[PDB]
Amino acid sequence: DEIDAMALYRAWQQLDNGSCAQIRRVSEPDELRDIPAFYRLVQPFGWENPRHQQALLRMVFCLSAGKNVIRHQDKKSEQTTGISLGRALANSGRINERRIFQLIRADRTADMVQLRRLLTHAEPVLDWPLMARMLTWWGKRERQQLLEDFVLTTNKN
Amino acid sequence: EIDAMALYRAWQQLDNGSCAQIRRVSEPDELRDIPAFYRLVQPFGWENPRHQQALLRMVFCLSAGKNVIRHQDKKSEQTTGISLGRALANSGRINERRIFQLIRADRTADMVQLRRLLTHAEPVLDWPLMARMLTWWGKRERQQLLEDFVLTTNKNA
Amino acid sequence: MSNFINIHVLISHSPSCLNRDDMNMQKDAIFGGKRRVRISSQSLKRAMRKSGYYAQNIGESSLRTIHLAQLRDVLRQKLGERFDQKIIDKTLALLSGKSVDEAEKISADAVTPWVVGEIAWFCEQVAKAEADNLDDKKLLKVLKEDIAAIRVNLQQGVDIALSGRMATSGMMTELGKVDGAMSIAHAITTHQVDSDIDWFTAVDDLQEQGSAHLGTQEFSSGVFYRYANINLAQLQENLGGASREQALEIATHVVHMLATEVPGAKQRTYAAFNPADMVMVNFSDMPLSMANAFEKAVKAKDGFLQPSIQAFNQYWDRVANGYGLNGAAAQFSLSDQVKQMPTLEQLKSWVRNNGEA
Amino acid sequence: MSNFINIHVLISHSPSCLNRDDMNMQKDAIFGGKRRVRISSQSLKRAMRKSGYYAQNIGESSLRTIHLAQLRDVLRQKLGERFDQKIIDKTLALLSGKSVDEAEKISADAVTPWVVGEIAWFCEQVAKAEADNLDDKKLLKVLKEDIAAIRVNLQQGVDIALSGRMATSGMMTELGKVDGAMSIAHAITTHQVDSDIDWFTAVDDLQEHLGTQEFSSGVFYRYANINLAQLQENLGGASREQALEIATHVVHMLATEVPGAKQRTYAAFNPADMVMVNFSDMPLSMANAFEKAVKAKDGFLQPSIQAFNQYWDRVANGYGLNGAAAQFSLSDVDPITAQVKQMPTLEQLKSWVRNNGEA
Amino acid sequence: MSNFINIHVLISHSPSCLNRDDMNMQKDAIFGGKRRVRISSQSLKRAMRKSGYYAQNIGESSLRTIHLAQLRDVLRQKLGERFDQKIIDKTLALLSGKSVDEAEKISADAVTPWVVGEIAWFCEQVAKAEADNLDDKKLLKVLKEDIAAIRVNLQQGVDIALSGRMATSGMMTELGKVDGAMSIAHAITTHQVDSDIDWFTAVDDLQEQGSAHLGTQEFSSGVFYRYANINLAQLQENLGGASREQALEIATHVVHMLATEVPGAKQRTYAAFNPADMVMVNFSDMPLSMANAFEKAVKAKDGFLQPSIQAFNQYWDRVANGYGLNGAAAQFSLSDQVKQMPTLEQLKSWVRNNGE
RNA sequence: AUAAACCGGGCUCCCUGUCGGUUGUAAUUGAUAAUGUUGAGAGUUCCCCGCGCCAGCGGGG
């Protein structure tokens, strides 16, 4: 029912350099639909179910920042979730607050483009399945929560 | 809407002279320069300008030959029949890059290339579904063609 | 005759930042559920007030301040040839409600508008009152008699005649209440705007800077809808009972300025000196804005300008028919019952002539 | 006489990356709902400021910094033969509002433009004020009385006279506040641009990993104007003709100078294909000629120039612009109607500008 | 005297694939709203640097790498007859900022250019410091006083003198910062190109026929515009203060190479060994490219070449008359105030003689 | 025609001034799209008019 995020992650990690190269050339999420290698990548992960397509398009798009741009790290046994996207972006020390500002205010499509730029720039360390859920919904609530996590992190750290 | 199987049956029973005369075009609009065309497509609402573009495409593909496109009805189990992309993939005669360069090919470049693929592959398919695809023929129907092709090729291997 | 005059402007700006807030981000507003970029009314006002067109066709502008010491010295300087120093000081005191020492720091209650002409007139009055050893509250009593005589002075302070003034202290509290004759709306864009950001640096000519964090400046371009109306009667009153012709004159200047003046912010580094591409003027018995023409935000097609102009025109047709608005209207446009005007000057003339030339 | 001089430039660049941000991305901007490529006004300014042409026809650039230690040392070396070190140190300390020790690092509030001529002048004043046991406050109030006398020194810092200066510390707050005479806009393309991407590598000569760079070509619209009166004022009261000469050099530089970025690898050393100069009472930009992004036909250049010419026709007729105007262009096709004098060469244009638009 | 030399080349290649990206697609660019085939400036620079002509006429080229271990071995073997091993290893360690063990793999921060002569000179310096118990710090500050004496070594690394060097570590970070003297553009076709696709197979000699699926390779022909300019003053400075004549010499060699050298890519399969059909050189006080001659993409008539040349000539006339370019200019061409040259050698001589 | 009815929270206000994101970088080496094939047959060609020995001939679309 729910999309496997970790599977897709590892899949993207072990992808052949040519396919990765072919996917890395999209400049917009929907362009992934122009690319054979993409469908081959997401076929095992429920692409054929319309419910999961938009979601998958985002996931891959962000991953398409690089083969190891998004470093996944498991959460600690103690805490209930791992590192959030905002927090990681803030932790990188390379992302300026106004970037997030203009991100959460961006139109559809544009936001994902911007996000991917931020990911290449930061090479964040985060709980990937968490980010994946976030991308799965990606609405007002989530954008806001992103900026909040960023702000509070940058505040303490 | 436009009756498909009617147009197909008309094409199957057209006289060989008209048939060969139609095949000879090299671009859909050239069909407008041919009488046999008008007599063929008039019973199916050519007179309504909304339906014209569509018809021009459909016939063009049919113009590959009187028996290049083999219709086959969908099985009662299945909700839809064999789409074009699946058919092409099933042929074993088409190369992925032909399809890729097909969906990235400009109005017009596009139909010519498709007809070449049709003659080459002589596909068995649910014709009215193809007809619908040709009725709309926009970014997502093209992308869907590529999807079906790639995914079928991966499935079958 | 119609009391109200409506001025609509569609003007398109190249990338720029014509107004910002406490975080130096472009001022915005939500309309139709989508973000428009906004140029506030006060900004437009001050733009027109301090313009050179104003200075050459309308006259002197009010002087808004809170530093009665500085104002003291200024007033001494430009009135010293007509009045005694303490006649001046006295007048200042009576109007401000604060004692005019030779202190170098004297604070009013708030930043208020000072028309110099007005103050000169009050200086004549206070001179009189000084000659007859008259008590202040009685001078007040006398002056409350004929307020029009004081408003006649706002012809050397038209900007207050247009935008009004509220009074809180001194005799102004009784004599100074002006209700503005011009209503003016915050400029907003006819389309959704996602603002761009400039990321700049400063190269230090004495050290090869390496890693650095770049400064940010929000900016955007946009097609703005400006709207203002003028209440002719109230202008006439605010000016001391001036003729309709003088009102219409001032109105025409407001049209010009609303069609040409652009706030000054960051213009030295973004240069958005664009004239307006559409100006329509419309006489009416009840003021009405055309903002709702762009509530459904304009989607671009070959730009935002033309689609905006057409949105405008269509809503104008629908409202004119719907509410039966037969009033003189004229439209000036750069692009190929409303009288069309080839040049801005023809429009201006039309307005001067009460809308029938 | 007209107070404002407007400079419009259409200049076409071959594949390049002339301005980028902290993420190696081309600077862009949205106009008419389509993406233009952008070159920031700062970039143009500093490219002009530091150019060779400026060095040969205007003079020495202002020295912009925030490091008062280094500045101290510099000022010593270039002025030492004229003043005691302690007069220099004191002048710097008074202007900056910080204390000039023999401290290794002494930082101002911000990167400020300094002119050595100006600092010298202040050194004289501080010296006579030293000889008269006059106190710093009174010195300040005295100097505040004749500002022009300080603005004359900006003839050795003309760029400041053009782009201005702000101060937040020291006597400069009262004295060194300069209001820029030249307004200049970001350069944007007249058309939509979808940037290309160069995928590159580096070959290791001792063994047997791809990077990326964004680039694009584009037809750019440069705009600037100069406020003659404010220039004259900012130069101490200089003549209208000296003003016009400086404005002329700005025309030249805006039509020929190009930011240095990525140029050694992309070489977009192109000159302008159209330059129009136009005299005016109220400054106006022609950017709106390209609000409707220019569609290509036989290039972007010709249709951009025609679009320009048309808008200028519409705006000039519509707003009744009677002002001296002249246009230099490398193209042959139909220009602006006869109130716009045509110039075969750039130098004829510049002469026409030097001559208040009558030659 | 004029400080800039502008080199313009029009060169027509036959079906080939002279530069491609990580998907083996031809490199392109959009100019004038149309697609042009492109050859990167790095491709051109490296082709020139590694060419035979450069080895015979200019000499040693830099050794760019990131493997300090391997470089250590190479440097030992190449300098071992002038310095003993420890001086070398120490010098390398100083210039790179890494410790030079006897380790198998010693990485620099990035691939950088190394000039062997330069390194040697540093070895002599380090050695003098060795005999005089001079601290490394003091050594550095001694070296920063006379930089030109370091730059005089770039006559055995002229490619660095032309295309610059950036250092981010070791003493090089203060000493190796080199400002390139040659600016060079990407080559772009003067006309639109829609690339062709070669569909190929690989026949198995032991497999009895059968339908295989075919590979693809993008290719195309095209008339390319090449541009570069040389900042003479900067070349002189970069070589330690060499005369103008040595600089005009180097510039001449660059004219030759830019007119004749073609990148080696896919040439064993496509062989586009074509020589330029036009070469013009132009002396100037401000660098200027002529790419805008082809902004309006060149329409074919009797090929792309002649219209391309014509376009070039007209736009040069316009630019010259409009911007008043009093400057030495000369043009060589294989077809029938700009001095014509019948042969490239005469153009080269005209350049060597400062255009007189 | 209800703790209701009657019943404005209302007047005034630039967020302004200063700022190159800059230096360096081959995508490169290998590769048949190949085997097999009459376009044969067949006077229909839709309308008007003239002539005719009603076999057809001719003029105009």
UniProtKB/Swiss-Prot annotation, chain A:
Disruption phenotype annotation: Loss of resistance to bacteriophage lambda infection, loss of plasmid silencing. Increased levels of 57 nucleotide crRNA and also 2 and 3 spacer-repeat units.
Induction of its expression: Repressed by H-NS, activated by LeuO. Activated by the BaeSR two-component regulatory system, possibly due to envelope stress. Part of the casABCDE-ygbT-ygbF operon.
Keyword terms: Antiviral defense, RNA-binding
Pfam family, one: CRISPR_Cse2
Record carries keyword Lipoprotein: no
Gene Ontology CC: protein-containing complex
GO MF, any single term: RNA binding
GO biological process: CRISPR-cas system; defense response to virus
Quaternary data: Homodimer. Part of the Cascade ribonucleoprotein complex, with stoichiometry CasA(1),CasB(2), CasC(6),CasD(1),CasE(1)-crRNA(1). The CasB homodimer forms a cleft that cradles the 3' end of the crRNA. Interacts directly with crRNA, CasA, CasC and CasE. Stable subcomplexes of CasBCDE-crRNA and CasCDE-crRNA also form, both of which are able to bind target dsDNA. Binding of target ssRNA or dsDNA causes a conformational change in the Cascade complex.
Similarity comment text for this entry: Belongs to the CRISPR-associated CasB/Cse2 family.
Functional summary from the UniProt entry: CRISPR (clustered regularly interspaced short palindromic repeat), is an adaptive immune system that provides protection against mobile genetic elements (viruses, transposable elements and conjugative plasmids). CRISPR clusters contain sequences complementary to antecedent mobile elements and target invading nucleic acids. CRISPR clusters are transcribed and processed into CRISPR RNA (crRNA).
Annotated protein name in UniProt: CRISPR system Cascade subunit CasB
Source organism of the structure: Escherichia coli (strain K12)
Curated annotation (Swiss-Prot), chain B:
Induction: Repressed by H-NS, activated by LeuO. Activated by the BaeSR two-component regulatory system, possibly due to envelope stress. Part of the casABCDE-ygbT-ygbF operon.
One BP annotation, GO: CRISPR-cas system
Keywords tagged on the record: Antiviral defense, RNA-binding
Effect of disrupting the coding gene: Loss of resistance to bacteriophage lambda infection, loss of plasmid silencing. Increased levels of 57 nucleotide crRNA and also 2 and 3 spacer-repeat units.
Gene Ontology cellular-component terms listed: protein-containing complex
One example GO MF annotation: DNA binding
The keyword Repeat is assigned to this record: no
Domain of life, source organism: Bacteria
InterPro entries with a match to the protein in the record: CRISPR-assoc_prot_Cse2, Cse2_sf
Functional note: CRISPR (clustered regularly interspaced short palindromic repeat), is an adaptive immune system that provides protection against mobile genetic elements (viruses, transposable elements and conjugative plasmids). CRISPR clusters contain sequences complementary to antecedent mobile elements and target invading nucleic acids. CRISPR clusters are transcribed and processed into CRISPR RNA (crRNA).
Subunit organization: Homodimer. Part of the Cascade ribonucleoprotein complex, with stoichiometry CasA(1),CasB(2), CasC(6),CasD(1),CasE(1)-crRNA(1). The CasB homodimer forms a cleft that cradles the 3' end of the crRNA. Interacts directly with crRNA, CasA, CasC and CasE. Stable subcomplexes of CasBCDE-crRNA and CasCDE-crRNA also form, both of which are able to bind target dsDNA. Binding of target ssRNA or dsDNA causes a conformational change in the Cascade complex.
Family statement: Belongs to the CRISPR-associated CasB/Cse2 family.
Name under which the protein is recorded: CRISPR system Cascade subunit CasB
Organism: Escherichia coli (strain K12)
Upper classification of the organism: Bacteria, Pseudomonadati, Pseudomonadota, Gammaproteobacteria, Enterobacterales
Gene it is expressed from: casB
UniProtKB/Swiss-Prot annotation, chain D:
UniProt keyword annotations, A-Z: Antiviral defense, RNA-binding
Origin superkingdom: Bacteria
InterPro entries for this protein: CRISPR-assoc_prot_CT1975
Record-level GO cellular component terms: protein-containing complex
Molecular-function GO terms, alphabetical: DNA/RNA hybrid binding; RNA binding
GO biological process, one term: CRISPR-cas system
Induction annotation: Repressed by H-NS, activated by LeuO. Activated by the BaeSR two-component regulatory system, possibly due to envelope stress. Part of the casABCDE-ygbT-ygbF operon.
Disruption phenotype: Loss of resistance to bacteriophage lambda infection, loss of plasmid silencing. Increased levels of 57 nucleotide crRNA and also 2 and 3 spacer-repeat units.
Disulfide bonds: none
Annotated CDD domains: Cas7_I-E (cd09646)
Quaternary structure, from the entry: Part of the Cascade ribonucleoprotein complex, with stoichiometry CasA(1),CasB(2),CasC(6),CasD(1),CasE(1)-crRNA(1). The 6 CasC subunits make a helical stack forming a groove in which the crRNA lies. Interacts directly with all of the Cas subunits. Stable subcomplexes of CasBCDE-crRNA and CasCDE-crRNA also form, both of which are able to bind target dsDNA, and at least CasCDE is able to form R-loops. CasCDE and CasCE complexes have endonuclease activity. Interacts with YgbT (Cas1). Binding of target ssRNA or dsDNA causes a conformational change in the Cascade complex.
Protein name: CRISPR system Cascade subunit CasC
Organism: Escherichia coli (strain K12)
